[PDB]
Design a protein around this ligand. Sequence first.
Ligand SMILES: [Co+2]
Ligand code: NA
Lengths: 164, 164, 164
Amino acid sequence: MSIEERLEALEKEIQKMKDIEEIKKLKGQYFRCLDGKFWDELETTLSPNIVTSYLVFHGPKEVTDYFKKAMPREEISMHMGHTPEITIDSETTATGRWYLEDKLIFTEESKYAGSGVNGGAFYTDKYEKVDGKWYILETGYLRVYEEHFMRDPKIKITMNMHKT
Amino acid sequence: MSIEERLEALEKEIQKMKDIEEIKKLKGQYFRCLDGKFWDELETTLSPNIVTSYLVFHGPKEVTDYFKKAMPREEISMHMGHTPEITIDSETTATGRWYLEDKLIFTEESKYAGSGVNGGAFYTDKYEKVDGKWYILETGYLRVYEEHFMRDPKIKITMNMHKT
Amino acid sequence: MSIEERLEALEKEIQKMKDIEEIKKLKGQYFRCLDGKFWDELETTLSPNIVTSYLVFHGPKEVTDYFKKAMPREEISMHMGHTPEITIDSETTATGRWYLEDKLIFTEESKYAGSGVNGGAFYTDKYEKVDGKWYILETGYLRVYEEHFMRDPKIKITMNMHKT
Ligand SMILES: [Co+2]
Ligand code: NA
């Protein structure tokens, strides 16, 4: 192989590994902003082209506006992603598998106060690169399991970033 | 350093980082297929040379056949890997540390219906590259802890991919 | 762009991706040694320049000596890191976000026997590279939540690496 061919071949491989890293970083930011309810920053993770259902939502603002109502202050959520499988499909598209464990806790001001939900899911994300930045375009999952229960009322929540 | 030496040095580094990525991806696939009970695909994660104990099992089919019996429909499992430490030992061999949290739930058709098991473990995997693809060759762990208990019978399992 | 400029540009990118990988590996080692109470090896994760508060501790030994007393044999801990966001700030400095789930169990010899603590946190680490190796320089977190409770006394801990 030529000098220029080998540099070209290396340059495309480094770009692919940068894309993989940026997508993993994007997903980390997504989960942090979702659970932190940092809605302004979470909006920046979502493709401008995002359309979601689920009555559909068009664009990052409508989607993030929905999350703001579906995930109020009174719900502590943890969406914990494990062992990704990222595939770069083209220079502007990618697919990513993430193994989720999810926990929901409903605090005393919730209509569902005392409730807990635990689950797991195999998520498949689609990403796209718009104007040189990777975004989440769509998401879907296969539910592994989900459980609903009333939390032991003797559990003391001593810290909560969403409280007053 | 020469032009060709620098290209050679870069080419081996990119290969190493591709191998690391492929091994992390392999492990993600492994856990997904194990917990999903997708046994045909899980078999593809295991080296053709795999021998396991545990009375030994030889080859991917015997090993995956054992998992099929040891992890029936009635057991929801989550094997959740965290913070890997991957070391590429040679061009065809690698070692990987994974911090596991494991959960087992026994559903109502199990002989052990109502039982839960939680634990943690420091796993060390060995991988090998056979005919240009990375596989899991062997695994072992140090148990951090394990706990056994009867689940609160008021917990409603509302979703379960293994059910009818 | 020149041949030498393109090799130089590739060489700095590969170094950055090696640094990212080394830092993720460092963090894995950190959590494993912390939860394993492998204090000699955990000391090696900490920058020689580390100063901590928390009355301050100076250096890896003082810091690791504190952990040895604050995390006795009788406390099973799991510090489970998820979905990192690593940024290399310069050739010798970096920042890393890690989403933590933490669990603490107090075994029967603890003064707090039967107690459990669960939580989550958004950690931000600072790392530095001293004499060609990455270390943890400082850490801080935003607590997502924390809960305290008495464990169901019918839970049997069947395995525990910290026991006799
Ligand atoms: Co986890
Ligand atoms: Na968990």
